[PDB]
Amino acid sequence: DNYIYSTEVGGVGGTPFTFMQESGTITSIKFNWSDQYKLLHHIEVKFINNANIYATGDPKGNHEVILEIDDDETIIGSVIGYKKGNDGRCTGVKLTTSKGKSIMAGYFEESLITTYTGKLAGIKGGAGSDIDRLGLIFLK
Amino acid sequence: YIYSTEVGGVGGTPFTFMTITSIKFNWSDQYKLLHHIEVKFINNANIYATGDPKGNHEVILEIDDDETIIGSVIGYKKGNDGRCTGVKLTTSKGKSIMAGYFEESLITTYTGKLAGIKGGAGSDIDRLGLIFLK
Amino acid sequence: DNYIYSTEVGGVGGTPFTFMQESGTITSIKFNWSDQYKLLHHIEVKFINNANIYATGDPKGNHEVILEIDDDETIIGSVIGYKKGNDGRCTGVKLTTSKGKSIMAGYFEESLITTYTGKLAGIKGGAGSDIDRLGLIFLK
Amino acid sequence: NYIYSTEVGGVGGTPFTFMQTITSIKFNWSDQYKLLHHIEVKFINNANIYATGDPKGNHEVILEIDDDETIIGSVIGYKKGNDGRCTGVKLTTSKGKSIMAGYFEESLITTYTGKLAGIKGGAGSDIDRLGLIFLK
Amino acid sequence: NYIYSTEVGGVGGTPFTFMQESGTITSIKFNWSDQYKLLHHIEVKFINNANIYATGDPKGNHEVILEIDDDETIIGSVIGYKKGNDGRCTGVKLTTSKGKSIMAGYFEESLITTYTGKLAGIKGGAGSDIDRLGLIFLK
Amino acid sequence: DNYIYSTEVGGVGGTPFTFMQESGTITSIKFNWSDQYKLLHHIEVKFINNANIYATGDPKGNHEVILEIDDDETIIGSVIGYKKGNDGRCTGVKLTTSKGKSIMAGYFEESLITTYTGKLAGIKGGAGSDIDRLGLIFLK
Amino acid sequence: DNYIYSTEVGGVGGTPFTFMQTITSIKFNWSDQYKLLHHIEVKFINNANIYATGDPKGNHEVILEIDDDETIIGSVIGYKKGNDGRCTGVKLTTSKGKSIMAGYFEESLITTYTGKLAGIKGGAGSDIDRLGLIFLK
Ligand SMILES: OC[C@H]1O[C@H](OC[C@H]2O[C@@H](O)[C@@H](O)[C@@H](O[C@H]3O[C@H](CO)[C@@H](O)[C@H](O)[C@@H]3O)[C@@H]2O)[C@@H](O)[C@@H](O)[C@@H]1O
Ligand SMILES: OC[C@H]1O[C@H](OC[C@H]2O[C@@H](O)[C@@H](O)[C@@H](O[C@H]3O[C@H](CO)[C@@H](O)[C@H](O)[C@@H]3O)[C@@H]2O)[C@@H](O)[C@@H](O)[C@@H]1O
Numbered sequence: 001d002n003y004i005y006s007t008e009v010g011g012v013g014g015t016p017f018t019f020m021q022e023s024g025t026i027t028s029i030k031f032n033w034s035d036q037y038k039l040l041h042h043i044e045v046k047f048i049n050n051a052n053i054y055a056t057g058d059p060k061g062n063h064e065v066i067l068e069i070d071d072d073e074t075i076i077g078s079v080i081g082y083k084k085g086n087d088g089r090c091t092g093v094k095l096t097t098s099k100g101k102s103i104m105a106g107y108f109e110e111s112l113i114t115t116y117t118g119k120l121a122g123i124k125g126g127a128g129s130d131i132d133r134l135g136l137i138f139l140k
Numbered sequence: 141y142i143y144s145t146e147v148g149g150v151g152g153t154p155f156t157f158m159t160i161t162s163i164k165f166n167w168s169d170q171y172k173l174l175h176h177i178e179v180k181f182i183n184n185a186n187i188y189a190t191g192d193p194k195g196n197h198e199v200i201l202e203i204d205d206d207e208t209i210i211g212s213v214i215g216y217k218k219g220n221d222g223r224c225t226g227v228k229l230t231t232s233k234g235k236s237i238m239a240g241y242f243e244e245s246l247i248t249t250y251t252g253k254l255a256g257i258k259g260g261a262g263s264d265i266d267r268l269g270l271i272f273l274k
Numbered sequence: 275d276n277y278i279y280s281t282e283v284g285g286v287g288g289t290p291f292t293f294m295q296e297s298g299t300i301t302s303i304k305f306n307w308s309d310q311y312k313l314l315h316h317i318e319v320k321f322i323n324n325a326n327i328y329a330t331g332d333p334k335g336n337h338e339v340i341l342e343i344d345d346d347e348t349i350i351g352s353v354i355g356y357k358k359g360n361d362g363r364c365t366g367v368k369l370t371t372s373k374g375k376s377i378m379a380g381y382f383e384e385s386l387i388t389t390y391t392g393k394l395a396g397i398k399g400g401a402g403s404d405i406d407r408l409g410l411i412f413l414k
Numbered sequence: 415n416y417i418y419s420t421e422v423g424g425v426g427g428t429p430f431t432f433m434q435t436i437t438s439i440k441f442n443w444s445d446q447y448k449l450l451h452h453i454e455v456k457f458i459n460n461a462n463i464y465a466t467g468d469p470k471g472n473h474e475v476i477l478e479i480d481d482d483e484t485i486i487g488s489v490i491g492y493k494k495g496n497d498g499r500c501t502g503v504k505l506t507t508s509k510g511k512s513i514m515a516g517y518f519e520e521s522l523i524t525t526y527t528g529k530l531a532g533i534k535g536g537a538g539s540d541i542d543r544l545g546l547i548f549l550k
Numbered sequence: 551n552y553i554y555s556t557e558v559g560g561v562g563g564t565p566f567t568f569m570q571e572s573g574t575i576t577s578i579k580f581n582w583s584d585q586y587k588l589l590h591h592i593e594v595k596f597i598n599n600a601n602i603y604a605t606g607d608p609k610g611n612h613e614v615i616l617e618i619d620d621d622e623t624i625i626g627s628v629i630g631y632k633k634g635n636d637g638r639c640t641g642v643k644l645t646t647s648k649g650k651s652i653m654a655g656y657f658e659e660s661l662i663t664t665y666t667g668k669l670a671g672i673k674g675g676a677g678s679d680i681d682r683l684g685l686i687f688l689k
Numbered sequence: 690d691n692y693i694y695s696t697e698v699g700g701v702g703g704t705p706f707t708f709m710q711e712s713g714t715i716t717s718i719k720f721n722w723s724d725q726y727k728l729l730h731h732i733e734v735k736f737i738n739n740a741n742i743y744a745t746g747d748p749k750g751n752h753e754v755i756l757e758i759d760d761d762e763t764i765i766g767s768v769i770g771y772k773k774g775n776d777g778r779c780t781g782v783k784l785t786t787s788k789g790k791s792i793m794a795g796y797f798e799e800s801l802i803t804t805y806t807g808k809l810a811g812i813k814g815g816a817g818s819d820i821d822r823l824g825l826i827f828l829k
Numbered sequence: 830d831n832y833i834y835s836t837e838v839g840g841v842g843g844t845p846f847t848f849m850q851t852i853t854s855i856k857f858n859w860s861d862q863y864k865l866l867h868h869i870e871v872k873f874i875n876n877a878n879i880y881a882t883g884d885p886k887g888n889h890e891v892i893l894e895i896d897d898d899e900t901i902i903g904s905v906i907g908y909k910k911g912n913d914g915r916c917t918g919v920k921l922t923t924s925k926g927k928s929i930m931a932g933y934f935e936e937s938l939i940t941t942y943t944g945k946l947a948g949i950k951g952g953a954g955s956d957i958d959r960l961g962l963i964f965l966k
């Protein structure tokens with residue numbers, strides 16, 4: 001591929017998902033989480049030049065954040081909080097862009113990945129009630 | 141034109157105001173929402189208003205002809221019964237404003253030259269999206 | 275005009291005033307205010323190459339601040355505090371210059387304008403006992 | 415060839431004018447009265463100390479200014495009105511030197527900046543009124 | 551063509567060397583415990599190689615992963631340890647040339663501030679714990 | 690003189706001292722001070738190209754600091770704390786160099802002098818049991 | 830010499846030592862019990878010998894490895910003054926934002942000369958009695 005694949009972190013649960021577009025970058029990402037369970041429950045992605053919302057997980061959470069990404073905007077800093085192991089869950093995400101935009105979703109109470117940086121082109125993982133595992137995908 | 145996600149509820153009357161030289165946010169401590177927004181444009185003296193100026197606070201941001209939004213955050217209640225609660229804007233000249241409350245959900249929007257606003261208002265600002273120039 | 279007019283903020287009361295010189299900018303501005311009423315009461319302005327003092331409002335306040343402005347010195351940051359509505363008043367002013375000078379007069383308890391920036395050339399509003407309304411005027 | 419910052423404070427005291435640039439300036443103030451009482455000034459190529467006011471205060475600060483050194487930041491605290499007094503001074507220089515004398519409880523002037531060339535005002539027992547004077 | 555940072559901690563554990571002919575680290579995982587306050591397990595991935603190299607026993611209740619871009623160097627590196635023959639490696643702080651930083655474990659006894667540069671591999675000794683850890687850099 | 694003399698600050702007491710070497714600058718300066726009396730007691734000075742330690746005052750203080758100065762290193766900030774008057778004393782010294790080296794000695798509880806900056810070439814004042822008075826001397 | 834010698838700070842005790850050949854590694858051993866340095870090890874560029882002095886009796890150590898092009902921009906040694914003096918701590922900061930901190934700073938301080946750390950010199954037996962840094966020009 002012409003892509004970089006960040007480690008999927010979290011557990012083995014959920015239905016798999018992959019969100020990529022043939023020559024497309026993420027223009028919008030949404031994280032839904034709960035104070036009650038301290039996990040991510042639901043993720044939405046929009047891509048450049050495509051009106052479709054791609055969604056996974058159950059939007060059961062009392063909070064959401066959206067990050068909109070300009071066409072020339074990169075991720076210069078990215079951290080995913082998670083519970084490790086087979087019954088693991090994805091708990092939080094901090095993103096920071098080349099234009100000083102940042103977002104913070106969920107909780108960071110067990111494990112952390114500091115991912116590869118670049119132009120966010122997609123996400124892969126598994127989800128059901130919760131976001132079980134999550135990995136970012138970048139352009140090279 | 142770049143259209144930023146309209147955030148908040150499906151309630152109130154649609155509006156579309158379409159570069160911005162002045163924007164005013166009216167909010168209340170009682171309901172912790174935006175109620176009223178005014179906009180003035182370059183080379184036009186008409187004031188475009190929406191929602192009800194019920195709130196006990198207002199802020200005005202005046203934008204220079206060559207000034208851009210380098211930072212923009214809208215707080216809101218998600219759901220069909222959603223509301224805009226708050227706006228934070230930061231400009232290319234270190235100017236910044238802060239209206240309302242940021243107690244539930246947040247969007248960090250596209251940046252650029254603020255060229256208009258779309259959404260729905262009645263008693264309150266139900267939904268708000270920014271619009272930028274390319 | 276070769277002038278930018280910032281929104282006049284506060285109420286409709288008081289006698290209109292406009293302080294502007296045919297080809298001059300403000301070299302000195304003084305704000306009078308009170309802890310008792312938590313409003314601006316009085317403003318004085320001197321201009322480059324003019325020894326007249328232009329005054330408006332009643333100097334009844336227990337506090338004053340003077341900002342002296344060098345000829346090549348601009349405002350880069352400007353905020354006016356006020357009470358909105360017909361019975362509105364101007365409550366405070368924060369100015370910051372291109373040479374790191376700043377001043378702070380009065381109170382910021384209700385409403386705010388972040389104004390246009392530039393070379394402060396004049397002011398315009400209404401005053402009697404109090405500063406009813408205030409708007410800044412800049413060069414282009 | 416001089417810029418005159420507003421003289422701030424009262425109408426009281428014997429007038430003074432110190433001009434000849436300032437190489438040294440000393441402020442004397444009291445915690446009892448919360449005012450400046452006394453100021454001394456030395457100038458470049460001149461060993462005379464020019465004083466005004468009564469050095470009754472329990473604190474002093476001296477700022478020595480290098481020959482190429484400017485004031486980039488200057489604030490004088492005062493009581494406004496005819497019975498007015500100069501209550502405090504903050505100076506910051508082009509070399510990151512700063513000083514703080516006295517109190518800032520009532521009124522403030524943020525003065526013009528530049529090469530500090532002299533001072534002017536009135537003083538008897540207290541510093542009644544103080545204006546800075548700058549080169550162009 | 552390689553710079554060897556001091557191996558810190560004890561003499562115990564099976565030796566290990568993770569390095570690939572003309573290949574730098576792209577991912578490194580540190581597993582540690584609040585119970586024993588040590589590193590227990592390290593995993594490493596290399597550029598153009600899908601094999602995971604692991605050592606120690608993954609019994610810790612915490613992990614951190616640092617992914618390294620191909621042009622990304624280490625500008626700050628601190629390893630926490632207990633000195634002596636019975637020694638252990640207790641913690642790792644890394645900072646990269648792109649403002650990425652990670653923090654694993656505890657810094658309660660001894661500290662090395664290592665050489666900097668392009669992290670090429672790791673060497674030391676591990677069994678149920680990481681006994682000893684040294685970094686390996688390109689020039 | 691090809692020297693600049695900073696005001697000597699503190700009292701008229703002790704024995705006069707003047708530490709200068711024709712065509713040599715300070716390479717080391719030691720300050721000794723007391724928590725008990727909150728004053729400087731004793732200073733030493735070494736010069737470039739001279740092994741003689743010049744000392745003054747009584748080294749009775751429980752603390753000392755040494756600043757070594759590289760041949761090309763200037764003082765870019767200098768503050769001396771002191772007690773004003775005939776019975777005055779020198780209580781404290783902060784120095785900062787052109788290479789970001791700083792030292793801090795003693796207490797700053799009464800009066801302050803922010804001195805001239807430049808190449809520290811010598812010191813002057815008076816001392817017996819304590820440092821009564823201290824002035825810095827700079828090159829041009 | 831083509832070297833700058835920092836003031837040796839501490840007491841007159843100990844066997845004298847001088848380690849010169851630039852430093853690629855320096856290790857400080859110190860105790861919470863006595864709150865002094867006890868032991869220093871140095872390795873040099875292109876030399877496998879470990880040069881050691883004092884007694885490694887302390888419960889803490891710190892190692893600073895120094896890249897070939899890396900200098901000391903900040904340097905503070907903590908000590909007890911007088912003839913029965915000791916060296917109590919070291920703070921070094923490098924041109925690459927690296928810093929280490931060993932032992933205690935409860936009495937006296939030297940802010941030393943800076944530059945490329947080329948060696949050390951002092952006296953030690955049970956403790957580090959005195960410590961001076963050596964720099965290139
Ligand atoms: O004959 C005395 C006169 O006294 C009062 O009116 C005059 C002033 O009253 C003040 O309290 C105030 O209302 C002033 O109003 C001016 O200033 C206010 C505040 O800025 C402004 O809003 C107004 O527009 C005016 O500029 C009045 O001047 C009354 O008691 C009156 O009845 C009486 O005749
Ligand atoms: O009767 C007036 C005044 O009398 C007493 O003060 C008198 C003198 O006091 C001196 O200490 C000094 O204040 C003199 O005034 C000079 O100094 C002040 C301060 O700068 C200045 O305002 C004056 O202009 C003079 O230069 C006074 O004359 C006191 O009883 C006082 O309370 C009383 O009002």
Ligand SMILES: OC[C@H]1O[C@H](OC[C@H]2O[C@@H](O)[C@@H](O)[C@@H](O[C@H]3O[C@H](CO)[C@@H](O)[C@H](O)[C@@H]3O)[C@@H]2O)[C@@H](O)[C@@H](O)[C@@H]1O
Nearest residue numbers: 700701702703704746747776815816817818819820821
């Ligand atoms: O027996 C001699 C002397 O003993 C006592 O004074 C000793 C010292 O006491 C110090 O506190 C101080 O007073 C000293 O004064 C000298 O040093 C100070 C500090 O620098 C200085 O200001 C003075 O100018 C002196 O040089 C004393 O030396 C007393 O019992 C005394 O009465 C007796 O002479």
